[PDB]
Amino acid sequence: CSPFLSSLLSPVETVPLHDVTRTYSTMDVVDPPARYNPMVPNVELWGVFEGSEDNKPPAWFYRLCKLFYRTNDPYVWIPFNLLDEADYHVGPYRFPSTATYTHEQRTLLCLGDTRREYVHFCDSYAFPGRAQIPTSVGTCPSKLYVNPKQQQPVVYIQLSNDIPPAMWLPVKGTAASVRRVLAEFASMAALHRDWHHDEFMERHATAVRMLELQRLPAGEGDILRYMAYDARNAQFAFAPIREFPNQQEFFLGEHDDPEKLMEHVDLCPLLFAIPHMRTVVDLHAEHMIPTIAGPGVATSLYRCIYSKALLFVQVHLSSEVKLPPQDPEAFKFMWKDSQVLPKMRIPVFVRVVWPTNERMSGGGGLLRRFNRLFGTEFASDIPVDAAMALLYVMQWSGHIKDFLGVRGMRQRLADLLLASQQPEPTKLYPGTREIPNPEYTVAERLGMHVQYLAQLHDPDISLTIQRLLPVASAPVRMGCAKAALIAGDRELFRHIVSSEPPGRMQTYMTKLVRKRKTRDLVDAEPRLLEDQYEFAAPLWT
Amino acid sequence: VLVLDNVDDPGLLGTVLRTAAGFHYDAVIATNHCADLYDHRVIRAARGAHFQKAVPIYTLKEEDGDNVYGMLNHILQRNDLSPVCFAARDDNDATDELDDLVRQLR
Amino acid sequence: TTYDAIREDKYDAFIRLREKFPELYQDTRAWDNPPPFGEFNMFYSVRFGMVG
Amino acid sequence: LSVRTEDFFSKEAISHARRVSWAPHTTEKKQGAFAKLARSNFSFAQEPYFEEEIEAHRKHHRPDVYIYKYNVSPTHFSLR
Amino acid sequence: PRHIHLAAWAVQEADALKRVCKIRRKQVDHTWEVVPVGRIIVNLMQESLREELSLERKWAVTKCMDPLSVANAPV
Amino acid sequence: TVGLLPAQLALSRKPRLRPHVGNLKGLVYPLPYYAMWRGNHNKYTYNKSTVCLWGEGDTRSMYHQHYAHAKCPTDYGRGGREFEYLTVKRGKMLQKPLPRVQYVAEGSKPVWLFKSWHTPLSSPSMWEREVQYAEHTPEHIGAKRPLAVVAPRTMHRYLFLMHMEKVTITVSPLLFGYGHTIQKAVLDFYRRAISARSPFPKDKVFLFYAIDHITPRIEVTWLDGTSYVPPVLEGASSQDLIQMVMEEAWLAADRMAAEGRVLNPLAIDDYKWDQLVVFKKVRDKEAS
Amino acid sequence: AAAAAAAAAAAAAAAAAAAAAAAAAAAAAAAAAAAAAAA
Amino acid sequence: AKRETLPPVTRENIWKEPQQTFFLPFAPYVRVVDYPKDPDAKFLKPVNIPRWKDYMQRTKPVIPRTWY
Amino acid sequence: RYRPIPESMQPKHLEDNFTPFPLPKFDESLEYGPVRLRNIPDIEAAKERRRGSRLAA
């Protein structure tokens, strides 16, 4: 009894297609073409009394303000622009007009009440504008809110207007604590500037030269846009991947046009506009066509604005379980004149790489409550901005349900197993090796989700594969083999391929990995050659 | 319609093919790890089953891209057919998918 | 022909994309913005030598 | 300068008339759609002459309107 | 020879990181295969050939590089 | 990179590809092999008239139905082997303004359609026009979007009557007895219609004999209520009739889609498999 | 959950040398034994 | 104008950097990559890096472009 | 008091109609399109910048 299982069993009714015996209505047809209508716009009390007269300075707040006023490179310096008691901003948190959150999501982000008012009294450390070059001086300041009616002297730090109260960093109400919390971000920004400023200067110079070459306006905005574009022409080897020790993968759901999600990722306000590495996912390009022995992974690396963490998005074009047609001429004849094309299923993961921090994540409790609220799987040490950016991107795309972690993938795999055990509904045509059906079935989706679980580093992936292998179908065995390759279990992959009976499945499984001889994998038992036995088992260990 | 599930015995498979040809079955389908339809023992058992047009023989393998259960369901739905199963031996009660699901949920 | 819908639509779309996505269609700039004369050109400019 | 994916990958050499659109998504080849659907991979004549194309709706229903000695249409003239 | 080829391939795979090239896939000598790994070189032979040419004994018995060793008569 | 071995460029024993070293006279432009197909020489460049096929230098004055419409008279150049890979001409370059789209209002905001290969090619959205102007929308036919400019160039040998609600064929047995080719054309069209692709084609196909021995005719009425009659004339085959009917059906489908009514797209079905069997038979026969 | 998914890379010792096979390098200096120098 | 007036001062980079004696490939091929675990697996190699066929074929700039 | 910084690290001024790379430039007909994606915060930011510039003018 889960939404995923319900969708798998009784899928929604799509464009009906009648026939002489039945009517197929659950086909996952591609989204009709997009359009842009200029007529449609892009967009879609107690606080007053406190500001007027009720506001009163308590002892602790007065002490903190006095310490900040006394103050006891711009990247490292932490300013504090204290306002006047009459000039304090009093009111609730107002989401920007471009906020697609639901009412429940807004309530959760406001902690059970959107009417709550937070008093903002001074600014704080500044961060560069999103469009600006990433290694630029801080421009947009941070805010320091304080709840006028709170039992404990809590002070909230808001890095920007795009993060709601649920992500505001709480502080112990001490000037030293606030200074240390801000110094964490200041030092992180200074390190980022010291590390990646020369690379961005080189990119800026190359962008200027390219604009000079291809006659184009050379304004500052034009140069910034061309740097963001040249992010496309970034080499994988010279990429800031594996930078910070901490890593964690997340699943962003299966899609059909990954560029549509990557556009949301690019336009996320919490990420810079000049990524270190970008790759357009043209599924129709000769090198990006998904296949069982598919091309691989399209990687795009973005850096967060405030906490200099990295979102390494990976569109896995390789993940597939559907065998190529054995009669391509007949398949083309079948699907030539068809005006209905089944929607693809390509997975997109994201590695979050963040520095070892003790205050940027908020002490752990903030992300613990965030996880308890949103059913996510964020690590307690994740920087707040990275988690907020991921949540915002998923909400904007419309795949919050598909935004799953290791436990979510485990539950999805369990639901897929339940669906596999239950009888499979019929489809347009059964599909044969000569003319396969481009419609993902229960077994194929189960194999793909096993691969996804393996991709999301799981200590129990090997055990799960070993338990699934005895009872499973050929697509599931293919998925298990690919999962074993992803994990790095050479012995498990060799066992799977040896157990696999002869067929095109085993052929493609052998073709997957880089091997010495196909016999080393195919021959479960050493087969004498020239009156000599070869033991290739040690190779795969 | 006839479906042969995990025969694995060339002589038994050939005799079954001969019986199907004699009874003029509409179509016979070898579904699960059945003995190779083209084998010396199978041909010895079946004199002319492979060369008879009346009894079309199909070999569906999930390891070559064929959704055999999908094909069976499609045939059943199209022809308004009824399924009947026959097992040479009995069938006990034992499963581990429930344990796997429990572990995944935990 | 005085108004061919196919040509008109295709040309209008081409121009609109070239104008609104200069980065993506940078290579098409040379079609309408030829390099100026008097500046070094890779395939044309030949400079004198020296005597030593 | 340096190495780039523009240098890496080469586009299709297709004429403007044949090209359905210049959009980035349509930049690829037509057979790419079939290749993706199947999850697999896979010359002008000596005197290539084409008679000029006309809009579908106008060409299939051409009004029989004429002038002094020239056919007159909202898009085309002619002689008769 | 099959064992020799498999061992040579395994050594090359272990060196894959800094390895620049692979060995031949058609064993020229069916009783001796040598994999050079930078300053290190691995020689895989059969027992008969190993006993025939005692490279181990020669390289264990040969004296170290004495600078004064060159102070002798030519040969 | 540095670990790989690049091709020698400065020093090498291999042939350095400079055919112009001892074959060209005077100034040589760095453009490699610009005067190669001429015979690797840069002489006899003062000639204005050269050997020309149709569509080349001196044929501009002459008329050729193809080039007269597909090539500007001033764009003609030199002969085949004398092609102009590189031209240098003194003068003040003139950047003539590019053509301006016509029949478009001023300040109008168009509608943009994002074409992508994800949409199947057969869909009418691909043949639609990317930039859509409000003044290009026929508002009296009910259309919301402008009509597609391009149409598929397929030769319809079978009939697909899914988008048409009814088909009526009037025929005359007395004219059959007379023995006119129009009779056979209409009869074959009716046979192909009743063997068309739509499920139960006889449901939509109807045949009425000539109650008054009138000239045979065909009438196809679509879901929109509009009707179309393919002009039946002598020297018209069932193939031509089906081509006309299918082209007009595609046009009607485009008009209905522009109006804004959902139209059931076609998909592979029993008729598709029945065509597959014959296609496989044809392939086998060709292979034999 | 969080601990199950998160992966923290090991601590890379400062100025750590790596051999051809990427194995961790321990302090080891070699000098010509046959050479009888002054130290 | 060129024959009459002086040309602009030479850029510092032009006369300080050398003219590279080699011409590196348009699509250099690097089979080595540290992203996928167990690099023996081919189906995880990044697609953004060139193939050997691309490395050999890409002897000229991209189609629309003319200048190197 | 603030330490001097280079022009490279100093922030760059932006025009009233500036948008990042993925978004298109500004034109009279297509004000901020063509973009299928909706609810773009940067387009609203550009509109606010235009309003501020107009008010200043």
mmCIF file of N, CA and C in Angstrom, chain A residues 210 213-214 236 279 286-288 294-299 312 314 316 318 351 455 482 485-486 488 490 511-514, chain H residues 26 28 30-51 53-54 65 67-68:
data_model
loop_
_atom_site.group_PDB
_atom_site.id
_atom_site.type_symbol
_atom_site.label_atom_id
_atom_site.label_comp_id
_atom_site.label_asym_id
_atom_site.label_seq_id
_atom_site.Cartn_x
_atom_site.Cartn_y
_atom_site.Cartn_z
ATOM 1 N N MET A 210 37.397 34.342 -26.964
ATOM 2 C CA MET A 210 36.411 33.728 -27.848
ATOM 3 C C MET A 210 35.371 34.743 -28.304
ATOM 4 N N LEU A 213 37.012 36.637 -31.013
ATOM 5 C CA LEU A 213 37.070 35.832 -32.228
ATOM 6 C C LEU A 213 35.723 35.813 -32.936
ATOM 7 N N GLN A 214 34.707 35.246 -32.292
ATOM 8 C CA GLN A 214 33.348 35.280 -32.829
ATOM 9 C C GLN A 214 32.748 36.626 -32.455
ATOM 10 N N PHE A 236 37.022 16.739 -17.949
ATOM 11 C CA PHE A 236 36.695 15.940 -16.774
ATOM 12 C C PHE A 236 37.896 15.794 -15.848
ATOM 13 N N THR A 279 27.647 19.277 -19.080
ATOM 14 C CA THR A 279 27.536 18.429 -20.260
ATOM 15 C C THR A 279 26.069 18.323 -20.643
ATOM 16 N N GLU A 286 25.223 10.463 -31.334
ATOM 17 C CA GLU A 286 25.757 9.130 -31.582
ATOM 18 C C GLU A 286 26.538 8.579 -30.399
ATOM 19 N N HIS A 287 27.035 9.439 -29.510
ATOM 20 C CA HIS A 287 27.808 9.004 -28.359
ATOM 21 C C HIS A 287 27.016 8.991 -27.060
ATOM 22 N N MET A 288 25.741 9.376 -27.083
ATOM 23 C CA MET A 288 24.918 9.430 -25.881
ATOM 24 C C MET A 288 23.665 8.570 -25.978
ATOM 25 N N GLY A 294 25.909 0.807 -22.567
ATOM 26 C CA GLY A 294 25.710 2.184 -22.945
ATOM 27 C C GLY A 294 26.980 3.004 -22.916
ATOM 28 N N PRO A 295 26.875 4.268 -23.333
ATOM 29 C CA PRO A 295 28.077 5.112 -23.373
ATOM 30 C C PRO A 295 28.648 5.396 -21.998
ATOM 31 N N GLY A 296 27.807 5.751 -21.030
ATOM 32 C CA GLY A 296 28.296 6.009 -19.692
ATOM 33 C C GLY A 296 27.487 7.009 -18.897
ATOM 34 N N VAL A 297 28.162 8.037 -18.394
ATOM 35 C CA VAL A 297 27.566 9.010 -17.489
ATOM 36 C C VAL A 297 27.873 10.410 -17.996
ATOM 37 N N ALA A 298 26.850 11.258 -18.031
ATOM 38 C CA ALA A 298 27.011 12.676 -18.320
ATOM 39 C C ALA A 298 27.076 13.422 -16.994
ATOM 40 N N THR A 299 28.173 14.136 -16.769
ATOM 41 C CA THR A 299 28.474 14.726 -15.474
ATOM 42 C C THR A 299 28.425 16.245 -15.552
ATOM 43 N N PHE A 312 27.484 17.250 -7.772
ATOM 44 C CA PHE A 312 28.001 16.538 -8.936
ATOM 45 C C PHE A 312 26.848 15.697 -9.474
ATOM 46 N N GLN A 314 24.855 13.432 -12.097
ATOM 47 C CA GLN A 314 25.259 12.353 -12.987
ATOM 48 C C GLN A 314 24.019 11.787 -13.656
ATOM 49 N N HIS A 316 22.946 8.939 -15.825
ATOM 50 C CA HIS A 316 23.512 7.644 -16.203
ATOM 51 C C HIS A 316 22.829 7.171 -17.478
ATOM 52 N N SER A 318 24.018 4.932 -19.356
ATOM 53 C CA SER A 318 24.343 3.527 -19.565
ATOM 54 C C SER A 318 23.289 2.602 -18.969
ATOM 55 N N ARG A 351 25.896 13.608 -6.368
ATOM 56 C CA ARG A 351 26.824 13.490 -5.250
ATOM 57 C C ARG A 351 26.971 14.853 -4.588
ATOM 58 N N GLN A 455 24.384 2.120 -7.173
ATOM 59 C CA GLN A 455 25.001 3.424 -7.397
ATOM 60 C C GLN A 455 25.006 4.240 -6.113
ATOM 61 N N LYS A 482 25.237 -5.373 -13.549
ATOM 62 C CA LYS A 482 25.641 -3.973 -13.656
ATOM 63 C C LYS A 482 25.830 -3.353 -12.275
ATOM 64 N N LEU A 485 29.160 -4.466 -10.983
ATOM 65 C CA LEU A 485 30.218 -3.659 -11.585
ATOM 66 C C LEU A 485 30.307 -2.291 -10.923
ATOM 67 N N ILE A 486 29.160 -1.648 -10.697
ATOM 68 C CA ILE A 486 29.161 -0.317 -10.092
ATOM 69 C C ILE A 486 29.776 -0.372 -8.700
ATOM 70 N N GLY A 488 31.870 -2.604 -7.538
ATOM 71 C CA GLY A 488 33.270 -2.964 -7.641
ATOM 72 C C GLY A 488 33.535 -4.375 -7.161
ATOM 73 N N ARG A 490 34.165 -7.591 -8.303
ATOM 74 C CA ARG A 490 34.556 -8.367 -9.473
ATOM 75 C C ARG A 490 34.204 -9.839 -9.301
ATOM 76 N N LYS A 511 30.450 -8.216 -22.617
ATOM 77 C CA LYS A 511 30.869 -7.002 -23.308
ATOM 78 C C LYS A 511 30.939 -5.798 -22.378
ATOM 79 N N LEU A 512 30.201 -5.818 -21.266
ATOM 80 C CA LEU A 512 30.193 -4.670 -20.362
ATOM 81 C C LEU A 512 31.601 -4.312 -19.899
ATOM 82 N N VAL A 513 32.252 -5.222 -19.184
ATOM 83 C CA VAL A 513 33.501 -4.920 -18.491
ATOM 84 C C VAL A 513 34.679 -5.120 -19.431
ATOM 85 N N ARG A 514 35.802 -4.497 -19.081
ATOM 86 C CA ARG A 514 37.047 -4.698 -19.811
ATOM 87 C C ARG A 514 37.705 -5.986 -19.335
ATOM 88 N N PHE H 26 42.629 17.871 -31.744
ATOM 89 C CA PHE H 26 41.350 18.488 -31.416
ATOM 90 C C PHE H 26 40.598 17.692 -30.358
ATOM 91 N N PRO H 28 41.834 14.916 -28.016
ATOM 92 C CA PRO H 28 42.803 13.982 -27.429
ATOM 93 C C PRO H 28 42.105 12.850 -26.693
ATOM 94 N N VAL H 30 42.111 9.953 -23.871
ATOM 95 C CA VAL H 30 42.689 9.589 -22.579
ATOM 96 C C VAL H 30 41.806 8.487 -21.997
ATOM 97 N N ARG H 31 42.218 7.232 -22.186
ATOM 98 C CA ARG H 31 41.474 6.119 -21.608
ATOM 99 C C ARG H 31 41.490 6.169 -20.087
ATOM 100 N N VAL H 32 42.495 6.824 -19.503
ATOM 101 C CA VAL H 32 42.626 6.861 -18.053
ATOM 102 C C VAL H 32 41.596 7.812 -17.463
ATOM 103 N N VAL H 33 40.924 7.362 -16.403
ATOM 104 C CA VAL H 33 39.973 8.192 -15.674
ATOM 105 C C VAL H 33 39.757 7.550 -14.314
ATOM 106 N N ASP H 34 39.631 8.386 -13.284
ATOM 107 C CA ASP H 34 39.550 7.921 -11.905
ATOM 108 C C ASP H 34 38.145 8.022 -11.324
ATOM 109 N N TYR H 35 37.144 8.327 -12.142
ATOM 110 C CA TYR H 35 35.791 8.496 -11.628
ATOM 111 C C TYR H 35 35.159 7.152 -11.284
ATOM 112 N N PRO H 36 35.035 6.228 -12.236
ATOM 113 C CA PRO H 36 34.365 4.960 -11.933
ATOM 114 C C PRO H 36 35.250 4.027 -11.123
ATOM 115 N N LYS H 37 34.658 3.431 -10.092
ATOM 116 C CA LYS H 37 35.345 2.388 -9.347
ATOM 117 C C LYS H 37 35.514 1.154 -10.224
ATOM 118 N N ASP H 38 36.638 0.465 -10.047
ATOM 119 C CA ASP H 38 36.933 -0.681 -10.891
ATOM 120 C C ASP H 38 36.936 -0.222 -12.344
ATOM 121 N N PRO H 39 37.922 0.583 -12.753
ATOM 122 C CA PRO H 39 37.894 1.168 -14.104
ATOM 123 C C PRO H 39 37.704 0.159 -15.226
ATOM 124 N N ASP H 40 37.778 -1.145 -14.950
ATOM 125 C CA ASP H 40 37.567 -2.130 -16.004
ATOM 126 C C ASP H 40 36.172 -2.015 -16.606
ATOM 127 N N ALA H 41 35.215 -1.472 -15.856
ATOM 128 C CA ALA H 41 33.850 -1.345 -16.350
ATOM 129 C C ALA H 41 33.774 -0.234 -17.391
ATOM 130 N N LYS H 42 33.422 -0.598 -18.625
ATOM 131 C CA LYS H 42 33.309 0.375 -19.703
ATOM 132 C C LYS H 42 32.043 1.213 -19.617
ATOM 133 N N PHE H 43 30.934 0.631 -19.161
ATOM 134 C CA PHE H 43 29.648 1.315 -19.198
ATOM 135 C C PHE H 43 29.548 2.465 -18.205
ATOM 136 N N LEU H 44 30.618 2.785 -17.476
ATOM 137 C CA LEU H 44 30.621 3.912 -16.555
ATOM 138 C C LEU H 44 31.581 5.020 -16.962
ATOM 139 N N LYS H 45 32.280 4.874 -18.080
ATOM 140 C CA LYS H 45 33.202 5.909 -18.521
ATOM 141 C C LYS H 45 32.425 7.181 -18.852
ATOM 142 N N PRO H 46 32.929 8.365 -18.491
ATOM 143 C CA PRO H 46 32.229 9.598 -18.879
ATOM 144 C C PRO H 46 32.083 9.723 -20.387
ATOM 145 N N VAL H 47 30.964 10.285 -20.839
ATOM 146 C CA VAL H 47 30.684 10.399 -22.266
ATOM 147 C C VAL H 47 31.294 11.683 -22.810
ATOM 148 N N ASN H 48 31.566 12.644 -21.927
ATOM 149 C CA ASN H 48 32.115 13.920 -22.366
ATOM 150 C C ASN H 48 33.520 13.795 -22.938
ATOM 151 N N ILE H 49 34.292 12.794 -22.528
ATOM 152 C CA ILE H 49 35.642 12.613 -23.055
ATOM 153 C C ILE H 49 35.542 11.934 -24.417
ATOM 154 N N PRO H 50 36.495 12.141 -25.319
ATOM 155 C CA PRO H 50 36.373 11.586 -26.670
ATOM 156 C C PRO H 50 36.644 10.088 -26.698
ATOM 157 N N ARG H 51 36.170 9.463 -27.769
ATOM 158 C CA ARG H 51 36.507 8.090 -28.108
ATOM 159 C C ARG H 51 37.726 8.089 -29.021
ATOM 160 N N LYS H 53 37.787 6.684 -31.974
ATOM 161 C CA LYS H 53 37.284 7.017 -33.301
ATOM 162 C C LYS H 53 37.155 8.525 -33.468
ATOM 163 N N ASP H 54 36.637 9.214 -32.449
ATOM 164 C CA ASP H 54 36.564 10.670 -32.507
ATOM 165 C C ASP H 54 37.957 11.285 -32.567
ATOM 166 N N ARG H 65 32.204 25.914 -37.846
ATOM 167 C CA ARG H 65 33.391 26.732 -37.646
ATOM 168 C C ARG H 65 34.419 26.472 -38.738
ATOM 169 N N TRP H 67 37.790 28.604 -38.481
ATOM 170 C CA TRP H 67 39.069 28.886 -37.848
ATOM 171 C C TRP H 67 39.372 27.845 -36.779
ATOM 172 N N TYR H 68 40.633 27.432 -36.709
ATOM 173 C CA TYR H 68 41.053 26.417 -35.751
ATOM 174 C C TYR H 68 40.734 26.856 -34.329
#
